[PDB]
Design a protein around this motif. Sequence first.
Motif, PDB file in Angstrom:
ATOM      1  N   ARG A 240       0.828  -1.197   0.000  1.00 22.14           N
ATOM      2  CA  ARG A 240       0.000   0.000   0.000  1.00 22.14           C
ATOM      3  C   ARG A 240       0.869   1.257   0.000  1.00 22.14           C
ATOM      4  O   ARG A 240       1.898   1.322   0.677  1.00 22.14           O
ATOM      5  CB  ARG A 240      -0.914   0.005   1.226  1.00 22.14           C
ATOM      6  CG  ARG A 240      -1.930   1.135   1.246  1.00 22.14           C
ATOM      7  CD  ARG A 240      -2.885   0.995   2.423  1.00 22.14           C
ATOM      8  NE  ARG A 240      -3.928   2.015   2.403  1.00 22.14           N
ATOM      9  CZ  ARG A 240      -4.915   2.096   3.291  1.00 22.14           C
ATOM     10  NH1 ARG A 240      -4.998   1.212   4.276  1.00 22.14           N
ATOM     11  NH2 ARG A 240      -5.819   3.061   3.192  1.00 22.14           N
ATOM     12  N   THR A 247      -4.097   1.427  -4.462  1.00 16.65           N
ATOM     13  CA  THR A 247      -3.552   0.442  -3.531  1.00 16.65           C
ATOM     14  C   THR A 247      -4.376   0.315  -2.255  1.00 16.65           C
ATOM     15  O   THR A 247      -4.220  -0.649  -1.507  1.00 16.65           O
ATOM     16  CB  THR A 247      -2.072   0.738  -3.164  1.00 16.65           C
ATOM     17  OG1 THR A 247      -1.973   1.980  -2.450  1.00 16.65           O
ATOM     18  CG2 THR A 247      -1.221   0.805  -4.423  1.00 16.65           C
ATOM     19  N   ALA A 248      -5.263   1.275  -2.016  1.00 16.61           N
ATOM     20  CA  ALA A 248      -6.112   1.244  -0.830  1.00 16.61           C
ATOM     21  C   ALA A 248      -7.373   0.415  -1.076  1.00 16.61           C
ATOM     22  O   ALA A 248      -8.138   0.149  -0.147  1.00 16.61           O
ATOM     23  CB  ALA A 248      -6.494   2.663  -0.425  1.00 16.61           C
TER      24      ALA A 248
END
Length: 487
Positions: A240, A247-248
């Motif tokens: 992340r 990426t979250a």
Amino acid sequence: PFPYAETDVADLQARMTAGELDSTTLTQAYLQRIAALDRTGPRLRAVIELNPDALKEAAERDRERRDGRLRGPLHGIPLLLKDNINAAPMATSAGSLALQGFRPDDAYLVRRLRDAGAVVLGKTNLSEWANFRGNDSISGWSARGGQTRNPYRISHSPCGSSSGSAVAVAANLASVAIGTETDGSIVCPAAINGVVGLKPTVGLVSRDGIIPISFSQDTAGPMARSVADAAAVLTAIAGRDDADPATATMPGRAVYDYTARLDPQGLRGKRIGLLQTPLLKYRGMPPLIEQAATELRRAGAVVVPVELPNQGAWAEAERTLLLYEFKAGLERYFNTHRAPLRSLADLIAFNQAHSKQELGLFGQELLVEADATAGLADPAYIRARSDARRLAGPEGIDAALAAHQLDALVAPTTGVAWPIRSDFPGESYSAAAVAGYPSLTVPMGQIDGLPVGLLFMGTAWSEPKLIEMAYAYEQRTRARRPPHFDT
């Protein structure tokens, strides 16, 4: 015979850990090979720029090792990075002369690789602007890096847009490499050059610090000679990053060791759908794909013929979303990293002013079309982004997986390399690229001496399963054959 040819990351690591090899020796060996095959001899031109600090980095990793301060599985392992990925102190040009003196700080994934102990040997050539510049473009060509060549037959194409990374790995110019894919840029050149290429789910690996095309489809990914090597690299770069919202979106992300999925019995109980398209009848392909299906079945998997719903129906929507996202993303990147270029208009003007060096082989029609897009608030763009994602994912790959309760879809990745100085119908990798889903190609043989790969595609976040299956297939076939050089 190159002493490190075809040697896996884990083996190189074992050798260094046993004190029979050190990073500086390995690093200098690759640099010498690059000088002999990339810059001279066959002139593969896979490497666009060497890292002046490569030896320094290797020596520091060795000092740390002697001090008992190891960083992990990649400690001291030399690798190459596609030239659209930021990495100090080298330039990040995307192959363009406009950014030859632009040297931004490390991209997130590069910081992760260096923290893991990897040694950056340099940057690899790519189709200029990751092949999003003009029509009738030449794969593997850039104004700054020239023409990258396929090591299996230097007169033929290395494909793209991650040309140098695939060629470098195939020619043993580094242990592993990083490429990027928007639509085919990792898996196609990987297959064309007889190596493994893995394009993860969008969001698994941060895109921060990478010259973009599409935030909806872009992703970096590993390129290696083996699935185990690719898994080791993925383990280091996945993570992340606050700078990349995608990426979250990953569900239950954890410090995952993908090498734990290197299961030789990984195909047992699995269900695979063999995609039916004209590519199965490509000249010389029938015997290869038939053998692959048999190997999958003998390994314990059920293989059934299936058709991908909505195959290619997203073409128009994808074209639209890429144009809009390219302008928005590129200009954001230029601003964020304070590049010498501030807008897409500046780039278009630069190429025109340097037409002799930049526009001699083909034009910049995509840059021109992208610059004329209104913006991300345009209803037409919003609809296109939504439609493409829906058609390729939920109503595409996912529909096929659900119809026969499959774990993955497989098919030949593409055809074979073509003469550079001169699109194979039936390809399926676009589905994964547009859906933002994972895909992975593994060598499955050759046709007339040119590599052919077997493509695996799955739903979002299925990398662990895809790796298990790909590894199991690879271990019972070991089809990769290194390229043969004249001298």
